[PDB]
């Protein structure tokens, strides 16, 4: 479990932000260039709080595959000039399944806590929230509002960003790198 814990901390501290949108608190990854990742529910509107600033949203992308169905991500960018490190390499192409990840969240309600998740499995089709969804990661762990966005690693990989759970089960949408140019 350790080198997940240290790829994990270094990732959050180089790549993460909290973010407010009018839909709620999230953990948000930033990807490449201005470009960054919420889960789809969060809804951002022409502007969000970024680490208490006000930024302006210059694209949102809902994501759905080649048929329409929902992969409950927005991919966002941002009007700044700050460019975020590239960690696109980080990102599989497909679906990845781990015996040990860990899951970041960093927000008020929860500072910068990392969470042993276990085994990820890739569990597929989902119908989340009401809503047919696809390129769901399933772990085990007592789940909690306020970890979406929260972002699911392994020892040098990025796999997903929480999006939801009931119980202690927990669900990431699957983070690939063709949904980046
Ligand atoms: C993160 C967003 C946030 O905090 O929203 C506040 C209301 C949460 C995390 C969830 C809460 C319970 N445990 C978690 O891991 N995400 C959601 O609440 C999502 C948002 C969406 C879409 N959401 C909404 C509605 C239902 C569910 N859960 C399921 O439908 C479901 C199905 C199976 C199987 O397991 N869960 C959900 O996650
Ligand atoms: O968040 P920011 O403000 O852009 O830094
Ligand atoms: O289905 P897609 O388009 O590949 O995501
Ligand atoms: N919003
Ligand atoms: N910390």
Redesign the pocket.
């Given at each position: 479990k350790g080198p997940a814990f240290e790829f994990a901390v270094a990732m959050m501290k180089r790549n993460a932000s909290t973010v407010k949108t009018e839909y709620?608190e999230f953990t948000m990854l930033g990807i490449y260039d201005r470009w960054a990742v919420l889960?789809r529910?969060a809804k951002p509107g022409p502007t969000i709080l970024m680490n208490d600033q006000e930024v302006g949203v210059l694209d949102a992308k809902e994501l759905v595959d080649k048929d329409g169905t929902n992969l409950?991500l927005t991919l966002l960018k941002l009007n700044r000039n700050e460019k975020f490190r590239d960690i696109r390499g980080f990102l599989a192409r497909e679906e990845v399944e781990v015996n040990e990840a860990v899951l970041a969240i960093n927000t008020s309600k929860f500072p910068n806590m990392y969470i042993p998740v276990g085994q990820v499995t890739d569990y597929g089709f989902?119908?989340?929230?009401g809503?047919p969804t696809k390129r769901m990661l399933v772990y085990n762990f007592p789940?909690?509002?306020?970890?979406?966005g929260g972002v699911l690693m392994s020892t040098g990989k990025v796999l997903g960003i929480?999006?939801?759970?009931?119980g202690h089960?927990?669900?990431s949408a699957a983070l690939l790198r063709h949904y980046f140019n």
């Open positions: 709620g889960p529910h409950e989902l119908n989340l929230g809503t789940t909690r509002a306020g970890q979406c929480h999006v939801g759970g009931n089960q927990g669900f």
